[PDB]
Amino acid sequence: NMLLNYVPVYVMLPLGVVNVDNVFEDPDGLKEQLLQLRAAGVDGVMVDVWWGIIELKGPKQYDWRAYRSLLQLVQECGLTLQAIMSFHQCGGNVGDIVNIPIPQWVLDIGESNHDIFYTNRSGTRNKEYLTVGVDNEPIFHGRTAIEIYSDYMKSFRENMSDFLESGLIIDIYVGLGPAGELRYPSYPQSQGWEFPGIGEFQCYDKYLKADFKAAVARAGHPEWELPDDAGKYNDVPESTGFFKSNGTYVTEKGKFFLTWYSNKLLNHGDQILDEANKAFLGCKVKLAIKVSGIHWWYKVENHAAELTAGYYNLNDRDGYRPIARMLSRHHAILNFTCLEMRDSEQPSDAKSGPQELVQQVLSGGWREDIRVAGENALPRYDATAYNQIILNARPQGVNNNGPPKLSMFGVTYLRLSDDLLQKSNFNIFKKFVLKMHADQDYCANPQKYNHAITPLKPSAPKIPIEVLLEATKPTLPFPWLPETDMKVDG
Numbered sequence: 001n002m003l004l005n006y007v008p009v010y011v012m013l014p015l016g017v018v019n020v021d022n023v024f025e026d027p028d029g030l031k032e033q034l035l036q037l038r039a040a041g042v043d044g045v046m047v048d049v050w051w052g053i054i055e056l057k058g059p060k061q062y063d064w065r066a067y068r069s070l071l072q073l074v075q076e077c078g079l080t081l082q083a084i085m086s087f088h089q090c091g092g093n094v095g096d097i098v099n100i101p102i103p104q105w106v107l108d109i110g111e112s113n114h115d116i117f118y119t120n121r122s123g124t125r126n127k128e129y130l131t132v133g134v135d136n137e138p139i140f141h142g143r144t145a146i147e148i149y150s151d152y153m154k155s156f157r158e159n160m161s162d163f164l165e166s167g168l169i170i171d172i173y174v175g176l177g178p179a180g181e182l183r184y185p186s187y188p189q190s191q192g193w194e195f196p197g198i199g200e201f202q203c204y205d206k207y208l209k210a211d212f213k214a215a216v217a218r219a220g221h222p223e224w225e226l227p228d229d230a231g232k233y234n235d236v237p238e239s240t241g242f243f244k245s246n247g248t249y250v251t252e253k254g255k256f257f258l259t260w261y262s263n264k265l266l267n268h269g270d271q272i273l274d275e276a277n278k279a280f281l282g283c284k285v286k287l288a289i290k291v292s293g294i295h296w297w298y299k300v301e302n303h304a305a306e307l308t309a310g311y312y313n314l315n316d317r318d319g320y321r322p323i324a325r326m327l328s329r330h331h332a333i334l335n336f337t338c339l340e341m342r343d344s345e346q347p348s349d350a351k352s353g354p355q356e357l358v359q360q361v362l363s364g365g366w367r368e369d370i371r372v373a374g375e376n377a378l379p380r381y382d383a384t385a386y387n388q389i390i391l392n393a394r395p396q397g398v399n400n401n402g403p404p405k406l407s408m409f410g411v412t413y414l415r416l417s418d419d420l421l422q423k424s425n426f427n428i429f430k431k432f433v434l435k436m437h438a439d440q441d442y443c444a445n446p447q448k449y450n451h452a453i454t455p456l457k458p459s460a461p462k463i464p465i466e467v468l469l470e471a472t473k474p475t476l477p478f479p480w481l482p483e484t485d486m487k488v489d490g
């Protein structure tokens with residue numbers, strides 16, 4: 001039955017639906033919008049549960065009231081929810097139209113210890129996320145950063161227990177860095193970065209620097225230092241000593257640094273996912289993380305932007321599959337945040353390959369046998385964008401004999417706004433939803449299309465780093481159709 005080819009569609013709620021004062025501002029306004037989504041056949045919505053808003057007053061001073069009111073409304077409108085444990089700041093990234101800092105009390109600590117923030121070679125501290133360097137440092141009034149995230153999720157679980165039991169919350173997204181993605185803040189607009197700048201390494205805080213020097217010493221090279229020839233945010237790879245042909249990134253020193261730099265993210269993600277598994281154990285929900293889609297410079301040997309962001313991906317080294325393997329022990333979903341783009345839409349000098357990047361990442365996920373989800377990176381309302389998303393959702397088309405051999409677990413659309421609801425735009429969107437659903441009407445029971453959710457089980461045993469890095473072995477991607485068989489048209 002066609003229903004087996006059905007891929008659910010979710011929509012992101014506006015940023016700031018509950019303001020920085022922890023007040024659910026416009027319920028009536030949101031209700032009307034939500035009801036229109038319900039009529040269009042949308043399966044559910046996604047929302048940020050901001051750490052900076054809930055634990056503002058002080059350590060363990062949680063106020064969940066406004067968010068309970070929001071969840072209540074969403075449930076009344078017949079929609080499911082994907083909740084993001086947003087441990088990051090809203091404001092310094094593309095599209096951020098509102099400012100939501102991390103808890104003020106954490107910022108107060110940062111005043112007397114600036115090293116809790118990601119730092120670039122120039123000494124600039126980024127305050128949108130806590131460096132991975134303090135994950136296990138008990139400097140936050142007795143707690144470590146990971147313990148803070150852990151307590152936050154447990155409190156969420158207990159205070160929203162009634163919504164979890166009623167099946168409202170379907171996915172639990174755990175923020176792992178800037179914009180909630182597992183990556184370093186290598187391309188900060190707030191510091192002047194501009195597409196397609198290569199970005200900068202963000203490992204200069206005293207904690208990461210100390211770890212690196214200890215590590216190089218154990219490797220027999222205590223003289224080794226952090227990169228000093230990688231350039232600046234807006235540089236191009238060829239104008240740097242680190243990323244040029246036969247440059248530093250290809251030397252033993254460079255490869256050691258790059259492995260070290262990227263391994264820190266794998267462990268950061270693995271440890272926090274461990275805490276997430278414990279906090280939601282037994283609940284009927286799935287865990288998920290977000291991986292950023294850095295398509296610029298993907299078409300040159302150095303993959304500069306990817307490397308500075310923490311994804312050690314080269315033509316001969318798969319820097320994404322090991323993340324997929326790490327997610328398997330947690331039975332988690334890998335969400336790729338950039339699926340609507342086409343190569344021909346990028347300036348030629350950016351050397352972008354978003355289409356090839358998507359195929360690499362999704363194939364790696366299916367290869368490791370984990371579920372893969374996604375979102376569009378930029379606001380799009382045209383058919384060609386929707387058709388590109390539909391192609392990646394079922395790379396080899398629909399199957400009339402049963403389920404597709406390959407299909408994404410779901411797609412979340414960015415974002416809910418008045419432009420989307422504009423008559424003509426919404427008209428196209430409704431066709432998009434219909435095609436994602438494979439021409440079938442909205443289906444309320446996820447079980448009908450093999451999307452039933454079982455109680456979350458404890459994570460499988462810890463996979464050693466050496467076994468994780470075995471997944472760096474390059475593999476051929478799965479075959480992709482040139483265009484989807486379920487077009488929206490135009």
Ligand SMILES: OC[C@H]1O[C@H](O[C@H]2[C@H](O)[C@@H](O)[C@H](O)O[C@@H]2CO)[C@H](O)[C@@H](O)[C@@H]1O
Pocket residue numbers: 012015047048084086089090091093094095096179180290337338375376377378414
């Ligand atoms: O509300 C979700 C997050 O939205 C933004 O980040 C987006 C980014 O704009 C988009 O290109 C990509 O596809 O997904 C990320 C994360 O979903 C905000 O900057 C974040 O603060 C929000 O968490």
Ligand SMILES: OC[C@H]1O[C@@H](O)[C@H](O)[C@@H](O)[C@@H]1O
Pocket residue numbers: 094194195378
């Ligand atoms: O953040 C920089 C952004 O600039 C915009 O003008 C482009 O259209 C986006 O593709 C790009 O991501």
